[PDB]
UniProtKB/Swiss-Prot annotation, chains A, B, C, D, E, F, G, H, I, J:
Signal peptide: none annotated. The modification Omega-N-methylarginine is found at R44. The modification Phosphoserine is found at S19, S47, S51. Changing S47L: In fatal respiratory hypoventilation; unusual apparent autosomal recessive inheritance; reduced binding to microtubules as well as increased fibrillization and aggregation. It is linked to In Alzheimer disease, the neuronal cytoskeleton in the brain is progressively disrupted and replaced by tangles of paired helical filaments (PHF) and straight filaments, mainly composed of hyperphosphorylated forms of TAU (PHF-TAU or AD P-TAU). O-GlcNAcylation is greatly reduced in Alzheimer disease brain cerebral cortex leading to an increase in TAU/MAPT phosphorylations. Frontotemporal dementia 1: A form of dementia characterized by pathologic finding of frontotemporal lobar degeneration, presenile dementia with behavioral changes, deterioration of cognitive capacities and loss of memory. In some cases, parkinsonian symptoms are prominent. Neuropathological changes include frontotemporal atrophy often associated with atrophy of the basal ganglia, substantia nigra, amygdala. In most cases, protein tau deposits are found in glial cells and/or neurons. The tau/MAP repeat binds to tubulin. Type I isoforms contain 3 repeats while type II isoforms contain 4 repeats. The record marks K6, K12, K16, K26, K35, K38, K65, K70 as: Not glycated. Phosphorylation at serine and threonine residues in S-P or T-P motifs by proline-directed protein kinases (PDPK1, CDK1, CDK5, GSK3, MAPK) (only 2-3 sites per protein in interphase, seven-fold increase in mitosis, and in the form associated with paired helical filaments (PHF-tau)), and at serine residues in K-X-G-S motifs by MAP/microtubule affinity-regulating kinase (MARK1, MARK2, MARK3 or MARK4), causing detachment from microtubules, and their disassembly. Phosphorylation decreases with age. Polyubiquitinated. Requires functional TRAF6 and may provoke SQSTM1-dependent degradation by the proteasome. PHF-tau can be modified by three different forms of polyubiquitination. 'Lys-48'-linked polyubiquitination is the major form, 'Lys-6'-linked and 'Lys-11'-linked polyubiquitination also occur. The chain holds residues 623 to 695 of 758 of the full protein. It comes from Homo sapiens (Human). Interacts with MARK1, MARK2, MARK3 and MARK4. Interacts with PSMC2 through SQSTM1. Interacts with SQSTM1 when polyubiquitinated. Interacts with FKBP4. Binds to CSNK1D. Interacts with SGK1. Interacts with PIN1. Interacts with LRRK2. Interacts with LRP1, leading to endocytosis; this interaction is reduced in the presence of LRPAP1/RAP. The modification N6,N6-dimethyllysine is found at K6. It comes from the Eukaryota. This is Microtubule-associated protein tau. There is a cross-link at K6, K12, K16, K26, K38, K42, K48, K64, K70 (Glycyl lysine isopeptide (Lys-Gly) (interchain with G-Cter in ubiquitin)).
Amino acid sequence: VQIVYKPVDLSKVTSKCGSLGNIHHKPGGGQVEVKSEKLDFKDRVQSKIGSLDNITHVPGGGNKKIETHKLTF
Amino acid sequence: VQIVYKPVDLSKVTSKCGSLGNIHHKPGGGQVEVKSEKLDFKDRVQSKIGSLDNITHVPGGGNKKIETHKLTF
Amino acid sequence: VQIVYKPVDLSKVTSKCGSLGNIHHKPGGGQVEVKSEKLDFKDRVQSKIGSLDNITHVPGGGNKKIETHKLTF
Amino acid sequence: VQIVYKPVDLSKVTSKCGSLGNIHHKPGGGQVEVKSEKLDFKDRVQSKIGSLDNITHVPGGGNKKIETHKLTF
Amino acid sequence: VQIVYKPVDLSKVTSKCGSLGNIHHKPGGGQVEVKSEKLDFKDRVQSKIGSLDNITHVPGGGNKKIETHKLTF
Amino acid sequence: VQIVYKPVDLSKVTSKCGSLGNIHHKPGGGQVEVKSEKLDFKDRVQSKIGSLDNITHVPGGGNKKIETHKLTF
Amino acid sequence: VQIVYKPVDLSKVTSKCGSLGNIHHKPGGGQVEVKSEKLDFKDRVQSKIGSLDNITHVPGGGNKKIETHKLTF
Amino acid sequence: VQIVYKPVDLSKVTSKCGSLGNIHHKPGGGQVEVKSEKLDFKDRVQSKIGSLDNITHVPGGGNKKIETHKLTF
Amino acid sequence: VQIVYKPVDLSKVTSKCGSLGNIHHKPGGGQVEVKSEKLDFKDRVQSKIGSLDNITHVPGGGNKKIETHKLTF
Amino acid sequence: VQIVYKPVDLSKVTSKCGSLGNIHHKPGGGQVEVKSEKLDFKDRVQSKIGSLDNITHVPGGGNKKIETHKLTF
């Protein structure tokens, strides 16, 4: 048997911004509490427990491009 | 048997912005509580327990493009 | 047997914005409580328990394009 | 047997905006409570339990385009 | 046997807006309560339990285009 | 002229409580707004403007006794 | 002229409590706003403007007794 | 002229409490805003402007007794 | 003219508490804002502007007694 | 003219407490802002501007007694 796999891609992902400006992010603080006797995790776990966070993700043009090229028998 | 797989793509993903401006995000704080005796997770778990977060995701043009090219027998 | 697979795509995804402006997002804080004795998760679970969050997702043109190209016997 | 699969697409998805303006989103806080003795999830579950959130998704032109190209025997 | 599959598409999805303006979304807070002894979910479940949320989805032109191209024996 | 003023009082004000118990007062938050150009107050004014309060007055027996003894010509 | 003023008082104000207990006061937060150009107060004013407060006044027996003994010509 | 002023008082103010207990006061945070161009106060003013407070006044028996003994010509 | 002023007082103010206990006061934080161009106060003013406070006044028996004995011509 | 002023007082202010206990006061932090161009105070002013405080006043029996004995012509 014969297989040919030549997927072509000629693509653009473009972002044009003149100016972002004055981003103000001032969060007031809260309170967080957790109480859990026994905890048992296994096999590829990614958890977040009792967390009070604040993020400001201001990329000056942040673009993604994902591809996946699978081939199996 | 014979297979040919030459999918072509010539695509644009464009964003044009003159100016974003003054984004104000001031959250007042809250309160969060959890109480759970026994916790048991397994096999590819991603959890969030008792979290008080605040995010400001202001990309200056944030575009996605996803493709998946699967081939199996 | 013979197969030919040459799907062509020449597509645009465009966003044109002159100016976003003054986005104000000021949430007042609340209260959240959970009490659950035993918790048992398995096999590709993504959960959110007892969370008080606030998000401001202001992309300056945020566009998606998704494709999936499957082929099997 | 013979198969030919050459679906062509030449499409636009366009958004033109002069200016968004002054979006005000000020939610007053509430209260949320949950009490559940035993919880057991399995096999591709994505849940949200006891959550008090607020989102402001103001893309400056946010457009989608989805395609799915399946072929099987 | 012979098959030919060349569906052509040359389509536009356009949105033209001069200006959105002043969108005010100020929700007063409520109260939510749930009490459920035993919970058991399986096989591709996506649930929301005891949630007090507020969303403001103001895309500056947000358009969709979906296609599905299936072929099987 | 002659005046005699000997008002006698031998009074009890009693409260007997065995046990108060579990008083739960969890108010959900609201929103309040006021807009008033010019405000002019004088001469023994006690006002409350634009206030979102919550009180829990649980005295373990709270009793009043008031008297006023006036005499004039 | 003659005046006699011998008001007698032999009074009790009593509170008997065995036990108060578990008083829970968890208020969810709200939002308050005021906008008033010109404000002019005079002569014994006590005001409250734009206030979001929470009080828990749990005296273990809180009793009042007031008297006023006036005499004038 | 003659005046006699011998007001007698033999009074009790009593509070008896066995035990107060577990007073929980957890207020969720709110948001408060005020905007007032010109402010002009005079002559014995006590004001509160733009305040987000929380009080827990738990006296172990807090009793008042007030008297006022005035005499004038 | 003759005046006699011998007001007698033999009074008790008593508080009896066996035990106060476990007072929990955990306030979540809020946000407060004020903007006022010109401020002009005079003559015995006591004000509070833009304050986010928290008080826990737990006297182990806190009692008041006030008297005022005025005499004028 | 003759005046006699011999006001007698034989009074108790008592507080009896067996034990106060475990007072927990953990306030979450907030945010406070003020902006006021011109400020002009005079004549016995006591003000508080832009203050984020926390007090725990736990006297082991804190009692007041006030008297005022005025006499004028």
